[PDB]
Amino acid sequence: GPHMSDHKFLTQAVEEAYKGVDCGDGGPFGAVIVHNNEVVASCHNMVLKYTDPTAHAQVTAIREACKKLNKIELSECEIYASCEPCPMCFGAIHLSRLKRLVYGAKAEAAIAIGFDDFIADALRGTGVYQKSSLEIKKADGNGAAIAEQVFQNTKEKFRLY
Amino acid sequence: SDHKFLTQAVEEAYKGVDCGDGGPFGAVIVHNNEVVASCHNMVLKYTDPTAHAQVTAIREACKKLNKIELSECEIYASCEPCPMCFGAIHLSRLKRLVYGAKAEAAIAIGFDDFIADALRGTGVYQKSSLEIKKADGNGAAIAEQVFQNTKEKFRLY
Ligand SMILES: Nc1nc2c(ncn2[C@@H]2O[C@H](CO)[C@@H](O)[C@H]2O)c(=O)[nH]1
Ligand SMILES: Nc1nc2c(ncn2[C@@H]2O[C@H](CO)[C@@H](O)[C@H]2O)c(=O)[nH]1
Ligand SMILES: [Zn+2]
Numbered sequence: 001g002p003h004m005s006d007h008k009f010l011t012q013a014v015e016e017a018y019k020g021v022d023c024g025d026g027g028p029f030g031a032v033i034v035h036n037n038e039v040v041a042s043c044h045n046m047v048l049k050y051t052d053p054t055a056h057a058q059v060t061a062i063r064e065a066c067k068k069l070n071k072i073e074l075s076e077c078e079i080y081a082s083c084e085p086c087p088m089c090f091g092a093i094h095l096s097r098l099k100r101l102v103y104g105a106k107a108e109a110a111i112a113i114g115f116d117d118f119i120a121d122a123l124r125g126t127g128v129y130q131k132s133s134l135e136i137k138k139a140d141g142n143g144a145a146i147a148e149q150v151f152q153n154t155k156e157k158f159r160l161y
Numbered sequence: 162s163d164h165k166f167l168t169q170a171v172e173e174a175y176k177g178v179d180c181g182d183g184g185p186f187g188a189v190i191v192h193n194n195e196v197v198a199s200c201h202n203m204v205l206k207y208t209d210p211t212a213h214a215q216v217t218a219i220r221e222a223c224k225k226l227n228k229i230e231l232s233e234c235e236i237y238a239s240c241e242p243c244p245m246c247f248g249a250i251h252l253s254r255l256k257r258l259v260y261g262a263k264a265e266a267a268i269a270i271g272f273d274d275f276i277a278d279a280l281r282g283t284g285v286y287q288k289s290s291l292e293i294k295k296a297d298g299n300g301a302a303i304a305e306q307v308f309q310n311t312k313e314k315f316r317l318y
């Protein structure tokens with residue numbers, strides 16, 4: 001059920017992170033968008049491949065899912081992010097109308113290997129103007145440990161962008 | 162020079178509304194008074210809810226200059242950038258933002274109450290360093306007028 005599906009899709013997002021950093025497409029971040037347990041898009045960060053600083057894993061997955069589904073609203077879909085989404089990605093998640101976000105690692109795990117200290121107030125509940133009502137789940141247990149370890153494991157395979 | 166490029170971003174907003182590409186928003190990225198990108202919202206054309214004017218402009222500028230950072234460049238936005246767009250402006254390292262209309266002008270004709278704390282100075286976890294100018298006088302009047310003039314010329318998203 002939900003738990004098994006959640007763990008499977010977060011694991012897919014983590015594997016995308018490893019795949020993308022391995023082939024030089026971008027940093028170690030993956031995202032999977034699912035429609036009633038059917039995968040619509042499975043993507044990783046493409047900033048280096050695309051020369052596009054907006055091509056984070058989550059944005060790339062939204063772009064792909066919307067193109068595939070022929071609609072700009074992903075209201076029947078959920079997104080699994082290997083790492084907590086940044087302010088841009090969390091904004092994109094809002095604009096796409098995704099109904100639920102599950103993420104694996106806290107942003108601090110990426111910041112620990114040198115990524116920008118760039119965290120979404122609306123995800124953490126700390127804004128004045130931007131407020132979220134999106135359903136948000138932070139992974140726990142085995143899936144969370146596997147997600148957090150990505151950054152220490154991939155430190156030397158890529159250069160920070 | 163600020164009025165010229167703000168006015169070009171507003172012209173883009175009108176053109177994109179007129180051809181059905183997206184909503185009434187445009188953005189212009191410049192390097193030392195040379196236009197590097199001139200775009201409008203492409204959400205409807207591209208079937209892409211991330212294709213706001215500012216994101217589109219960033220993608221096109223990064224392609225034109227063949228690099229992922231625009232630290233020598235400034236962005237002119239016909240309307241206050243949203244949390245997504247202002248985050249993209251942060252990631253692209255643009256050094257200055259000039260924007261025409263406050264978000265309230267767009268909210269007034271039906272867009273989401275969807276405002277970037279970091280732009281307004283109320284971020285906790287997100288703190289901006291880039292220089293931000295809200296237009297005044299004629300530039301503000303032109304930019305606010307977009308929303309009254311385009312009111313029912315496009316589909317909301
Ligand atoms: N979750 C995620 N974070 C990214 C990505 N690319 C860069 N980062 C950075 O990693 C940190 C944690 O999200 C922030 O500085 C992000 O901007 C991406 O594709 N996905
Ligand atoms: N500045 C700007 N706002 C947009 C655009 N598309 C939709 N909006 C919405 O307009 C409001 C003010 O930025 C927010 O709800 C935005 O999400 C765009 O392309 N540019
Ligand atoms: Zn991001």
Ligand SMILES: [Zn+2]
Pocket residue numbers: 213214215242243244245246247
């Ligand atoms: Zn925007």
